[PDB]
Design a protein around this ligand. Structure first.
Ligand SMILES: COc1cc(C)[nH]c(=O)c1CN1CCc2c(Cl)cc([C@H](OC)C3COC3)c(Cl)c2C1=O
Ligand SMILES: [Zn+2]
Ligand SMILES: [Zn+2]
Ligand SMILES: [Zn+2]
Ligand SMILES: [Zn+2]
Ligand SMILES: [Zn+2]
Ligand SMILES: [Zn+2]
Ligand SMILES: [Zn+2]
Lengths: 463, 359, 128
């Protein structure tokens, strides 16, 4: 108890004190470092200047015409103007990063607050000769930094298991990081392609160290504590037993206890269910695969006909799921997923700029390369497109209703293929294990050394 | 400082670059070089203000426009060497002793805004480009040691860069508002440099493998609020300017953090203070320093030339003198001290060169 | 075949000794590797322990470019062979284990591997 007006003045006074204090103890740090930095200056400057002494560099001497005048009446000078022999320049190119697959990209401090609170506190103590009127006075001089409440709270103010601080924890809390940050689709943590975090159903099918690992392992092994013993390492059948007692982009659907009918996201997006969906294995909307024995590049094969590459987990019979060490396989419909692109060469175009040339003969309808770049939203493409127009020039290509791929900052060599309305290549968007990817195909046979072109207009028409 | 001569080169084009030859032997006359339009010009400095015209080259190509130049030497021959480059993205090494263009490097995919030689190794050339990247060349062995750009390099044109005194790290700045630190004393980089001197094209079927450094050892967008067009080291502190009419002194990390223990994820910067001036809000205007880094000089868009004394305590008390002259009224693009500080040269939009002497 | 070609990463001219090795056989381009592990570290939400396992896995997956579910068993056996020494020396043996049980919740591997892998790891630790 001692007056609100009084306290507000103290707030204003201690704060203004502290501030002015930090201000000086900080003007000195500066002063300190300017000096002990200038010691470094002279220290290393000497080193150079000595390395300079040990040299005898030659003086420069004198030599179509050029002259220089003086604006201070000095005599004009005239000297011979030597020509530097021409040198050819290469076309313009802005910096870019190599990609072999698409890459997604999205669209009164606290230190002082505490000192002031403490300094105010010590006045409340010396008064009697973490209080409550103090926080109300501070909220009155800083109505913004929070209310009386938030300031009382702000003032007072993820396990690891292999470490010294392991806890006994839930199993779905030791596993939490792995479960949310893991992409079931491309088998990587915090992956570069798939923004929507994993569906909840997709990851379901004594010290901290030991107790936690116990609950994790029973959720997998259940009651066979014999094995839970082998894995927990330093316990036994028994001991465990005893512890027990005490065109739209594709996105996996997950609608528990409910069929894939017309309310289903996949069905509405007009997409098939994939192996990534959490629905009946008997789902009518899943795509089967094909039972081909080879080839897979004609309307005979349901995948090719559906404009999908083959799935190495459903197409068991054509070759798509085997021989991982070769890129040339029985199946001719998985060039994108294995990245079996053709050698490409970079040189200035015969039209303009840079162009791309194929290093070896390619056959009609043959895959050449995936057109790779950043995946960005239609919104980001708008932003970026304003910047790009200044350059009369752009490398955005629609992937689907939701995403554009932009080979401006990242992509592979095929982005040097120029545009033409009489192309020798075309672009086809395939569905590939749940990703839309752009494949570039030869439109006719093509010979060694030929320059590549396709017609950008068809990409540019997500009309 | 007193104004002691003013010159005008016939071509009437902006002069973007001036550099004294800090390799001139003790005793030899002070030489400096100028670049602008498609030309490179050399001058000898004498007393009572006489600036003597020594050499001038013109690019065969009318559409070349040189922005920058820099002096180095040849270890073996002891010749001075002048590198120049500009809007055609091409580096030429000139041998003023021989009137030869002896080397040239095509490669940058757009214009070259700055050029810097390594403080201790004459053969290492840093070039900074409008293509968004910098490149380190080894000009002895004609090889591209490293490209500094990529997923975490500059997102826009790079305007400037500078080695620190001993040649261990590079700092770069540009139009994306960013300043970035690139260490070249890492094992990777020193290995790449060693490797570059070994590369013999005649004894192999494969090209030299250039480093692709996509990641700076530190980057900040937090010093200036616009394009950053000049940066230099003052010690382990950085001096840098935008177009907000200040040169800003700052260091990466917090006040006590050591430039060399700073971590590539460091998000802190500390602003030590700044030098104020006016009417320098057009871009591509560059401040220069002494060899002994005792004083700093900047030129104006209306022709005023500022010189500070850096042997002080603070930017607050930073002693500033303003050189000025009825006849000098153009934008001063860049300045250059002689190795010893006796002379200060400034060059302008109007093709003019202004010589200021000391004492 | 009758034209001057250029390295696509440096724009320097490609000489006669030839376009032989492709400048982009980078299944895992360098910068993607560093970019990935840099992004993991930026997480203030995840152990230092479960991160160092996530990084190693990612680097491992990126180096071989697995693309089928039917490859994950071999991937985990490959992981320990190639990375087990690191997992041990950096003391990441339990976190690794949470990785296998997770990989199992995602229906990618069998229980027979989720310990056949833990077996070969220990088998390796004693080897030190
Ligand atoms: C994909 O690259 C190709 C492709 C083909 C077929 N042919 C070529 O010559 C080049 C090279 N090239 C051309 C000139 C160019 C300009 Cl004028 C503007 C931009 C970008 O705008 C689209 C700026 C946005 O900040 C840079 C870029 Cl990214 C470039 C560029 O790299
Ligand atoms: Zn993914
Ligand atoms: Zn569904
Ligand atoms: Zn579905
Ligand atoms: Zn379904
Ligand atoms: Zn088939
Ligand atoms: Zn199939
Ligand atoms: Zn097939």
């Amino acid at each position: 108890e001692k007056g609100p007006i009084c306290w507000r003045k103290r707030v204003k006074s201690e704060y203004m004190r502290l501030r002015q204090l930090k201000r000086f103890r900080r003007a000195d740090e500066v002063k300190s470092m300017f000096n002990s930095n200038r010691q470094k200056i002279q220290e290393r400057t000497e080193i150079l200047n000595q390395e300079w002494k040990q040299r005898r560099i030659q003086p420069v001497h004198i030599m179509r015409e050029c002259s220089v005048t003086s604006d201070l009446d000095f005599p004009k000078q005239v000297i011979p103007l030597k020509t530097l022999n021409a040198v050819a320049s290469v076309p313009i190119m802005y910096s870019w990063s190599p990609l072999q697959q698409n890459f997604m990209v999205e669209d009164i401090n606290d230190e002082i607050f505490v000192e002031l609170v403490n300094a105010l506190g010590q006045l409340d103590r010396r008064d009697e000769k973490p209080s409550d009127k103090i926080f109300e006075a501070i909220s009155s001089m800083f109505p913004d930094k929070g209310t009386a409440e938030e300031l009382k709270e702000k003032y007072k103010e993820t396990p690891n298991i292999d470490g010294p601080n392991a806890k006994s924890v839930q199993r779905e809390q030791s596993l939490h990081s792995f479960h949310t940050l893991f992409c079931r689709r491309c088998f990587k943590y915090d992956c570069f392609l798939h923004p929507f975090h994993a569906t909840p159903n997709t990851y379901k099918r004594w010290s901290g160290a030991e107790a936690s690992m116990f609950r994790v392992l029973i959720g997998t092994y259940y009651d066979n504590f014999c094995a839970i013993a082998r894995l927990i390492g330093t316990k036994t059948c028994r001991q465990v037993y005893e512890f027990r007692v005490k065109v739209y982009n594709y996105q996996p659907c997950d609608h528990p206890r409910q069929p894939c009918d017309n309310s289903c996201p996949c069905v509405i997006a007009q997409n098939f269910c994939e192996k990534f969906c959490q629905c009946s294995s008997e789902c009518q909307n899943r795509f089967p695969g094909c039972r081909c024995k080879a080839q897979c590049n004609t309307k005979q094969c349901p995948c090719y006909l559906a404009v999908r590459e083959c799935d190495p987990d459903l197409c068991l019979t054509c070759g798509a799921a085997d021989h991982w060490d070769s890129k040339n396989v029985s199946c001719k419909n998985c060039s994108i997923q294995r990245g079996s692109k053709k050698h490409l060469l970079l040189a200035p175009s015969d039209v303009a700029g840079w162009g791309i040339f194929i290093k070896d003969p390619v056959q009609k309808n043959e895959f050449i390369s995936e057109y790779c770049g950043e995946i960005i939203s239609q919104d980001e493409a708008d932003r970026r497109g304003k910047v790009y127009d200044k350059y009369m020039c752009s490398f955005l290509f629609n992937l689907n209703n939701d995403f554009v791929v932009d080979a401006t900052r990242k992509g592979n060599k095929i982005r040097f293929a120029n545009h033409s309305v009489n192309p020798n290549c075309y672009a086809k968007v395939m569905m590939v294990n749940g990703d839309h990817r752009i494949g570039i195909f030869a439109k006719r046979a093509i010979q060694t050394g030929e320059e590549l072109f396709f017609d950008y207009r068809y990409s540019q028409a997500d009309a | 400082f007193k104004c002691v001569n003013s010159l005008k080169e016939d071509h009437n084009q902006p002069l973007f670059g001036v550099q004294f030859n800090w390799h001139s032997k003790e005793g030899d006359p002070l030489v400096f070089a100028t670049v602008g339009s498609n030309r490179v010009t050399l001058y000898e400095c004498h007393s009572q203000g006489e600036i003597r015209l020594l050499q001038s080259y013109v690019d065969a190509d009318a559409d070349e426009n040189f922005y920058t130049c820099a002096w180095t030497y040849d270890s073996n021959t002891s010749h001075p060497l002048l590198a120049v480059a500009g809007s055609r993205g091409i580096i030429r090494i000139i041998n003023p002793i021989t009137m030869q263009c002896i080397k040239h490097y095509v490669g940058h995919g757009n214009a070259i805004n700055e050029l810097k030689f390594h403080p201790r190794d004459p053969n290492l050339l840093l070039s900074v480009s409008k293509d968004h990247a910098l490149r380190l060349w080894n000009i002895q062995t004609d090889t591209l040691v490293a490209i500094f750009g990529g997923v975490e390099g500059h997102r826009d044109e790079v305007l400037s860069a500078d080695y620190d005194l001993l040649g261990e790290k590079i700092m770069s700045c540009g139009m994306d508002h960013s300043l970035k630190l690139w260490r070249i004393n890492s094992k990777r980089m020193m290995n790449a440099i060693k490797e570059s001197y070994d590369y013999n094209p005649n004894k192999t079927n494969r090209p030299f493998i250039s480093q692709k450094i996509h990641f700076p050892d530190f980057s900040t967008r937090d010093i200036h609020r616009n394009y950053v067009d000049c940066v230099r080291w003052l010690g382990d502190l950085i001096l840098s300017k935008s177009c907000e009419n200040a040169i800003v002194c700052w260091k990466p990390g917090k006040m006590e953090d050591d430039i060399d223990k700073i971590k590539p994820s460091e998000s802190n910067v500390t602003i030590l203070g700044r030098f104020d001036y006016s009417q320098c809000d057009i871009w591509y205007m560059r401040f220069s320093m002494d060899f002994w880094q005792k004083m700093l000089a900047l030129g104006n868009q209306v022709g005023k030339l500022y010189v500070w004394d850096l042997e002080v305590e603070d930017p607050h008390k930073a002693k500033c003198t303003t050189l000025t002259h009825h006849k000098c009224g153009a934008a001063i693009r860049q300045t250059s001290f002689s190795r010893d500080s006796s002379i200060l040269i400034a060059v302008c939009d109007d093709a003019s060169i202004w010589r200021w002497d000391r004492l | 075949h009758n034209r001057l070609y250029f390295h696509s990463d440096t724009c320097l001219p490609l000489r006669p000794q030839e376009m032989e090795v492709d400048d982009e056989d980078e299944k895992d381009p360098e910068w993607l590797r560093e970019k990935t592990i840099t992004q993991i570290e930026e997480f203030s939400d995840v152990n230092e322990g479960e991160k160092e396992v996530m990084k190693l896995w990612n680097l491992h997956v990126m180096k071989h470019g697995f693309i089928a579910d039917n490859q994950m068993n071999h991937a985990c056996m490959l992981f320990v062979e190639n990375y087990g020494q690191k997992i041990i020396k950096k003391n990441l043996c339990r976190n690794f284990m949470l990785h296998l049980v997770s990989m199992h919740d995602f229906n990618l591997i069998s229980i027979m591997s989720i310990d056949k892998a833990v077996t070969k790891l220990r088998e390796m630790q004693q080897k030190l």
